[PDB]
Design a protein around this motif. Structure first.
Motif, short mmCIF file in Angstrom:
data_model
loop_
_atom_site.label_atom_id
_atom_site.label_comp_id
_atom_site.label_asym_id
_atom_site.label_seq_id
_atom_site.Cartn_x
_atom_site.Cartn_y
_atom_site.Cartn_z
N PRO B 119 -28.42 22.12 -40.49
CA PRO B 119 -29.26 21.22 -41.25
C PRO B 119 -29.40 21.57 -42.71
O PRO B 119 -29.50 22.74 -43.06
N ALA B 120 -29.40 20.56 -43.58
CA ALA B 120 -29.32 20.75 -45.01
C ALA B 120 -30.65 20.32 -45.60
O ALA B 120 -30.96 19.13 -45.65
N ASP B 121 -31.44 21.28 -46.06
CA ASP B 121 -32.81 21.02 -46.44
C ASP B 121 -33.06 20.86 -47.93
O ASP B 121 -34.21 20.72 -48.32
N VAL B 122 -32.04 20.92 -48.78
CA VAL B 122 -32.33 20.62 -50.17
C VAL B 122 -31.14 19.98 -50.87
O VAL B 122 -30.01 20.46 -50.74
N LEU B 136 -29.20 24.69 -47.22
CA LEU B 136 -29.92 24.59 -45.96
C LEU B 136 -29.71 25.83 -45.13
O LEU B 136 -29.29 26.86 -45.64
N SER B 137 -29.96 25.70 -43.83
CA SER B 137 -29.90 26.84 -42.94
C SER B 137 -28.54 27.52 -42.96
O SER B 137 -28.40 28.60 -42.39
N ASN B 138 -27.54 26.92 -43.60
CA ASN B 138 -26.28 27.61 -43.84
C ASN B 138 -26.48 28.99 -44.43
O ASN B 138 -25.70 29.89 -44.13
N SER B 139 -27.52 29.16 -45.24
CA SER B 139 -27.71 30.31 -46.12
C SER B 139 -26.70 30.36 -47.24
O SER B 139 -26.39 31.43 -47.75
N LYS B 140 -26.15 29.21 -47.64
CA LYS B 140 -25.25 29.13 -48.78
C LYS B 140 -25.54 27.85 -49.55
O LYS B 140 -26.01 26.86 -48.99
N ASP B 151 -22.06 32.37 -52.19
CA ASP B 151 -22.51 33.37 -51.24
C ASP B 151 -23.68 34.11 -51.86
O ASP B 151 -23.73 34.32 -53.07
N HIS B 152 -24.60 34.58 -51.02
CA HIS B 152 -25.98 34.59 -51.44
C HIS B 152 -26.96 35.04 -50.40
O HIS B 152 -26.70 35.98 -49.65
N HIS B 153 -28.13 34.41 -50.40
CA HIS B 153 -29.31 34.90 -49.72
C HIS B 153 -29.02 35.22 -48.27
O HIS B 153 -28.11 34.67 -47.65
N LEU B 154 -29.78 36.17 -47.74
CA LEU B 154 -29.62 36.67 -46.39
C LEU B 154 -30.31 35.82 -45.35
O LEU B 154 -30.38 36.22 -44.19
N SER B 173 -35.37 31.42 -50.93
CA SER B 173 -34.93 31.62 -49.56
C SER B 173 -35.99 32.33 -48.75
O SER B 173 -36.94 32.89 -49.29
N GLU B 174 -35.80 32.33 -47.44
CA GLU B 174 -36.77 32.97 -46.57
C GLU B 174 -36.57 34.47 -46.48
O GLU B 174 -37.26 35.13 -45.70
#
Ligand SMILES: [Mg+2]
Ligand SMILES: [Zn+2]
Ligand SMILES: [Zn+2]
Ligand SMILES: [Zn+2]
Ligand SMILES: [Zn+2]
Ligand SMILES: [Zn+2]
Ligand SMILES: [Zn+2]
Lengths: 261, 299, 97, 68, 185, 48, 157, 95
Positions: B119-122, B136-140, B151-154, B173-174
């Motif tokens: 899911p893509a939240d922004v 989104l929840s991809n974390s990318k 590539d990026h947040h954990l 990010s969370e």
RNA sequence: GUAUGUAUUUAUUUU
RNA sequence: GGAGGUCAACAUCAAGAACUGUGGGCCUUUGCCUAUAGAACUUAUAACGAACAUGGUUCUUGCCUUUUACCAGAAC
């Protein structure tokens, strides 16, 4: 005429936009009777005006014109007036005609309709004296430009000339390089008052140059009443002017005195 | 003078007789009409004539700033919606793993962008480049050619923004960090760790950002907060809005950090359902979608 | 009260209000009573605030029950400047009622 | 001469005090002076107010106020 | 009693052309702008409908000593500013008659109460480069003169003035005590 | 309490209705003369 | 007697309901007049008041047209209104007088209040002030009665 | 008890701790150096910390020329001067 | 009956 | 022209048990004597108020370091 006379004056600032009262936290708690702050003394309170005027852009006819009032809106001189064409006072730069109307009452009180006091003020403050006509404004705190260093004093001189030059007919201007002060001198007392109230706490350079968008953090430049000129030259120049003008009004004295018989 | 002269003469005055001339925040309006929750809100950047509001019912209902139209076409809830400036386009994005374009002219889906894992939240629309930024929840963070993967947040990426100069993408990010991205080289320009999940950001219309967390709303080139836990919006007057999950509306000044007002919404005709999911200002009014299935307009 | 009569004041015919209403500055209307009570409370509170600050004391706070409390511990010259007489305090108590 | 007093809407008063609630402005320099003056006549107003109490059987008394 | 009984002193000039005038009399007004003592104040309006209001500034005494007008503060006869009439007078005779006045406070608050009078009272981008300029004349004169014939900087230490019109074409026009020459890049 | 400013009459109170006062049940038969106007604010205003 | 619904108040007469909407639009506006919209400038303040005064005038002018022009309601409905303070008895009475038909207020004809003379320039017909203006050729300086906001109560204008 | 006690009480301090967060009070007539220079903050602040030095430079500078005759005393005071003037240098250098 | 007093100039007045 | 008004101004309200006007006589206007007309409001277990407060001075006390604030009687 084609510029000011026809086109009616336009609102400078919407009434909701006007700054709040109650200057900020100069002290510990707010005070109701005096509007000041209570205990302690914060670093001295001064700030650049968010506002400035635009002589050909804003100025236009208003209700005082049709009502024939003498005196000028100072919130226009500050460009802060929210009453627009509804304003009770004139919006435009003083000309020689209108000073022609004021000439009888310019002695006791300034062009904005405020009585002058006797002694000037300790620091040469807001309003001048009714004893001595003083046409010379001291411009100081040139750090209103903030910290920008300039290629020459022709930057300061030139810029100031283009600033006050709008506000009325200038007799002379001298910027001083050593000690930072301009000395600006006008035909008429009226333009001097109006310019004083107009350019106090203001900024400099271009509508955009360099640090321009940070300008509101600056201190703003003192415009105060200036003392005499100590050097012998201008002192000769004053003595002579007083002489010839005294001579000029002796003509009136002998014309109405001749009518007296 | 004469009676006829006067009678004719008066009507000249503008308004009959005799006055006729010779010569804080509060709650303005409540709009029901969504079946589910209201997740996201965006406003027409040009004319200010309407809203686009996501929902939890998958729809989008375009409200007049009355209900104009309904835009269906997502199978699952719509987390984010963003409208374009230079384009007559509307980019909506959901939990269905898809970023769907919308041609405002004819109101039909034009393009589907593909390749998120989940899911893509922004979505945020880069101002000058004709790009999309999705996350989104991809974390990318995916830079879509209306190309780059960051590539990026954990952990998941809640909120993403776009800026014309350097860093062109700010992300939150969370993992409780906020990264300032350099996209051309494609790696983090700066990391801001001071948050102890950052669920919302807003760009000051001063070149700074306001970042959020549970109890502390910071700014970035502080804001006084007791526990407000757990969106932000920045008026052009430097007013900084903060929506609560406790239903409290925490208004701030942006310069200071001072909180000059806190309000409480009325739930509806559960006390848990009172919160503020999204919010925005027009191009002097405030629009807040709430979890109670209503949009509220604060004046 | 029977033993010491009074026999009041001829020429007293002039009353505070009959003199007061005359001027431009007072206007007459009707109104609900409780509303006049509340207004008058607001009146008083503004009066005593302006008299307190006008004297220069900003660290004496009035609450809305007309209790006058210091907001700080006071240096001695404060206690000297800040002694308020029976005029103020008496009127304070009275409004409090 | 002497036309008697001119009775007015209550809304007017409501606006006057409603306004003076917050005053910080310079325009109030007289009104502030005006307040302290009235401080002399208050206990009179306390009397006239308190002798008019509505009494239990009445619900709300309606009075004629004279305001500055 | 003492304050009322002397009548006011007003010019005929500023008091206006109206035949009959209604003025207000306040038994205690502001203090003088001079002596800093109370006195009795007078409003009026020149015209019946004139917006402006006239307020006598100084005392009767602080006037009488100086023999001036309370609304104008011009000499009672000649309609002259005080600092002038004593200069004309001082031109006759040689050195005298300057009015030495009252610094501090009770210096002046004192002084106004003596009946002595005061001395005046007692008797009654195209740059043209400009050279050859007298230091004395003001820029206002120059430009006005050019305007009469048909924007500017000067330096007065230098005695050199530069002039930029809004168009060389003006240059030709004006070209239809000075050193002119026309140059800029 | 001391921290609550006095509530503005033009908002809270004016809408809320008086919540009936004391009076008395009186009597219908015995008081028939005086039952009508006994509790009026000013007991008799219009009478010649 | 009071504006309020207090139990002693006699219930409304017959013709009331038909005019209740028209009056409500007035009420809801007066609510907006006192709400204390703040302003720094004096002119704006006494402008705020001018709003209230004018509204009151409009309402009483509405009722006056109802009973004394169209006779659109009963006498008893009328008197019940006056006793409930929906109208201004004295003001209407001035309207029934000869030359006062358009009057502002009860202040504007107060002889005592004004310093000299009486009767605000608010009461003087434009047709004249234009003439005394013509003598001066300064046009005319008047705009609003400071009490009210009137321009030309006098019933010609 | 001398007002040294009365100015340091909690009821005095707490309003200062509110004025820091709500506005531009907090003096700088109170605190001391702060010992390290480079650890100071945005310029509009060190600006005031700097005058908070120059003032003492003026006081004790006047306190130099005084005839009052204590030479050991003016020696230690002289060293104190040098120390402070060096601090002034440091605050300028950071700016 | 918790003293009191002095100083706290930042924004540069024409040779 | 009548009814009113929580309107105003100006008079009058504590005294020989008491008010005012006028006619006539004496003294020389006052004043005394005599004759005549009209007397609202307030008064006999005395007073405009079928009610009921405060202040000033002077004495007598009462509390009791002193002053405001006071204790309870009197006179003005
Ligand atoms: Mg002693
Ligand atoms: Zn204006
Ligand atoms: Zn004087
Ligand atoms: Zn004059
Ligand atoms: Zn009116
Ligand atoms: Zn009027
Ligand atoms: Zn009118």
């Amino acid at each position: 005429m084609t510029s000011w006379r026809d086109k009616s004056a336009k609102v400078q600032v919407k009434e909701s936009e006007l700054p709040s009262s109650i200057p900020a936290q100069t002290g510990l708690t707010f005070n109701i009777w005096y509007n000041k702050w209570s205990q302690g003394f914060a670093g001295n309170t001064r700030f650049v005006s968010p506002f400035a005027l635009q002589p050909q852009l804003h100025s236009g006819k208003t209700r005082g014109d049709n009502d024939g009032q003498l005196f000028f809106c100072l919130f226009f001189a500050k460009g802060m007036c929210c009453l627009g064409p509804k304003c009770e006072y004139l919006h435009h730069i003083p000309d020689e005609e209108d000073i022609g109307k004021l000439a009888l009452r310019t002695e006791v009180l300034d062009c904005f309709g405020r009585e002058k006091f006797a002694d000037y003020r300790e620091d040469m403050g807001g309003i001048g004296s009714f004893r001595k006509k003083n046409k010379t404004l001291y411009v100081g705190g040139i750090d209103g430009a903030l910290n920008s260093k300039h290629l020459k004093p022709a930057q300061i001189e030139s810029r100031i000339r283009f600033v006050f030059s709008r506000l009325g007919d200038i007799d002379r201007i001298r910027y001083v390089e050593s000690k930072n002060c301009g000395f600006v001198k006008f035909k008429y007392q009226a333009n001097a008052e109006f310019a004083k109230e107009a350019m106090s706490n203001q900024t400099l350079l271009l509508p955009s140059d360099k640090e321009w968008d940070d300008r509101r953090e600056g201190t703003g430049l003192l415009v105060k009443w200036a003392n005499e000129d100590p050097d012998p030259a201008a002192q000769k120049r004053l003595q002579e002017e007083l002489k010839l003008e005294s001579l000029n009004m002796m003509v009136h004295l002998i014309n109405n005195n001749t009518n007296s018989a | 003078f004469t009676k006829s002269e006067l009678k004719r003469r008066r009507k000249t005055r503008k308004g009959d007789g005799p006055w006729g001339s010779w010569s804080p925040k509060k709650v303005i309006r409540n709009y029901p009409g969504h079946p589910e929750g209201t997740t996201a809100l965006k406003f027409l950047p040009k004319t200010g004539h309407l809203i686009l509001s996501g929902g939890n019912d998958h729809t989008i209902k375009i409200w007049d700033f009355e209900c104009l139209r309904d835009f269906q076409g997502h199978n699952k809830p719509i987390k984010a919606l963003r409208f374009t400036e230079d384009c007559q386009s509307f980019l909506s994005s959901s939990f269905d793993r898809s970023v769907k374009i919308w041609d405002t002219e004819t109101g039909k889906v034009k393009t589907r962008l593909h390749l998120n894992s989940t899911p893509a939240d922004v979505e945020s629309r880069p101002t000058n480049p004709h790009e999309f930024i999705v996350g989104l929840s991809n974390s990318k963070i995916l830079h879509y050619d209306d190309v780059q993967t960051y590539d990026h947040h954990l952990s998941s990426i809640l909120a993403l923004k776009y800026f014309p100069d350097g860093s062109k993408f700010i992300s939150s990010s969370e993992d409780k960090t906020v990264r300032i991205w350099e996209n051309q080289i494609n790696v983090p320009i700066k990391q801001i760790s001071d948050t102890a999940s950052m669920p919302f950001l807003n760009v000051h219309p001063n070149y700074f950002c306001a970042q959020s967390m549970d109890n502390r709303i910071y700014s970035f080139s502080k804001y006084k907060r007791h526990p407000k836990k757990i969106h932000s919006s920045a008026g052009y007057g430097i007013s900084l809005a903060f929506s609560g999950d406790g239903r409290y509306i925490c208004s701030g000044d942006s310069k200071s950090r001072l909180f000059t007002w806190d309000w409480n919404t009325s739930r509806l005709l559960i006390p848990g359902n009172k919160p503020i999911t999204q919010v925005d200002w027009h191009p002097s009014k405030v629009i807040c979608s709430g979890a109670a299935g209503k949009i509220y307009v604060c004046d | 009260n029977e033993l010491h009569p009074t026999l009041p004041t001829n020429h007293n015919k002039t009353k505070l209000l009959k003199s007061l209403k005359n001027t431009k500055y007072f206007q007459q209307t009707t109104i609900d009573w409780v509303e006049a009570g509340l207004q008058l409370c607001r009146q008083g509170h503004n009066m005593l605030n302006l008299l307190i600050h006008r004297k220069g004391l900003t660290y004496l706070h009035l609450d809305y029950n007309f209790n006058l409390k210091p907001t700080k511990t006071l240096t001695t010259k404060e206690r000297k400047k800040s002694r308020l007489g029976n005029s103020f305090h008496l009127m304070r108590e009275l409004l409090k009622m | 001469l002497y036309t008697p007093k001119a009775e007015m809407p209550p809304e007017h008063l409501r606006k006057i005090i409603n306004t003076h609630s917050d005053m910080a402005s310079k325009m109030y320099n007289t009104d502030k002076k005006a307040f302290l003056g009235a401080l002399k006549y208050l206990p009179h107003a306390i009397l006239k107010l308190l002798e008019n109490m509505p009494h239990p059987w009445e619900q709300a008394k309606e009075v004629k106020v004279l305001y500055h | 009693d003492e304050i009322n009984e002397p009548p006011p002193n007003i010019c005929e000039q500023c008091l206006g052309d109206e035949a009959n005038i209604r003025m207000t009399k306040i038994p205690q007004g502001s203090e003088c702008k001079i002596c800093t003592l109370p006195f009795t104040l007078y409003h009026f309006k020149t015209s019946k409908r004139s917006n402006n209001i006239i307020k006598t500034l100084i005392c009767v005494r602080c006037a009488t000593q100086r023999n001036i007008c309370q609304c104008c503060m011009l000499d009672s006869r000649w309609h002259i500013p005080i600092q002038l009439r004593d200069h004309l007078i001082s031109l006759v005779n040689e050195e005298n008659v300057m009015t030495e006045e009252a610094k501090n406070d009770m210096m002046k608050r004192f002084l106004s109460l003596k009946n002595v009078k005061l001395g005046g009272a007692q008797i009654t981008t195209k740059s043209f480069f400009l050279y050859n300029i007298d230091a004395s004349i003001p820029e206002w004169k120059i430009t006005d003169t050019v305007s009469q014939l048909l924007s500017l900087i000067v330096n007065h230490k230098a005695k050199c003035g530069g002039l930029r019109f809004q168009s060389s074409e003006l240059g030709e026009r004006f070209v239809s005590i000075f050193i002119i020459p026309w140059s800029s890049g | 309490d001391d921290d609550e400013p006095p509530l503005s009459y033009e908002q809270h109170i004016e809408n809320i209705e008086p919540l009936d006062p004391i009076n008395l049940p009186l009597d219908s038969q015995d008081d028939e003369y005086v039952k009508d106007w006994l509790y009026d604010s000013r007991p008799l205003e219009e009478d010649s | 007697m009071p504006r309020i619904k207090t139990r002693r108040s006699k219930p409304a007469p017959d013709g009331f309901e038909k005019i209740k909407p028209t009056l409500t639009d007035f009420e809801i506006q007066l609510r907006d007049a006192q709400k204390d919209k703040s302003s720094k400038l004096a002119a704006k303040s006494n402008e705020q008041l001018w709003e209230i005064m004018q509204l009151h005038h409009q309402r009483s002018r509405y009722i006056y047209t109802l009973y004394y022009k169209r006779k659109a309601i009963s006498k008893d409905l009328y008197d019940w209104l006056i006793k409930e303070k929906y109208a201004d008895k004295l003001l209407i009475a001035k309207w029934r007088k000869t030359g006062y038909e358009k009057l502002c207020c009860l202040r504007c004809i107060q002889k005592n209040e004004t310093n000299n003379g009486s009767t605000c320039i608010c009461r003087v017909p434009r047709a004249q002030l234009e003439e005394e203006a013509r003598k001066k050729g300064t046009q005319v300086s008047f705009h609003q009665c400071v009490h009210c906001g009137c321009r030309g109560c006098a019933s010609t204008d | 008890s001398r007002n040294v006690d009365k100015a340091n009480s909690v009821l005095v301090r707490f309003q200062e701790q509110q004025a820091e967060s709500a506005g531009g009070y907090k003096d700088y007539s109170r605190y001391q150096r702060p010992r390290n220079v480079s650890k100071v903050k945005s310029i509009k602040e060190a600006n005031e910390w700097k005058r908070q030095v120059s003032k003492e430079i003026k006081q004790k500078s006047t306190r130099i020329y005084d005839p009052s005759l204590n030479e050991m005393q003016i020696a230690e005071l002289n060293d104190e001067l040098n120390n402070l003037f060096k601090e002034w240098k440091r605050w300028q250098w950071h700016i």
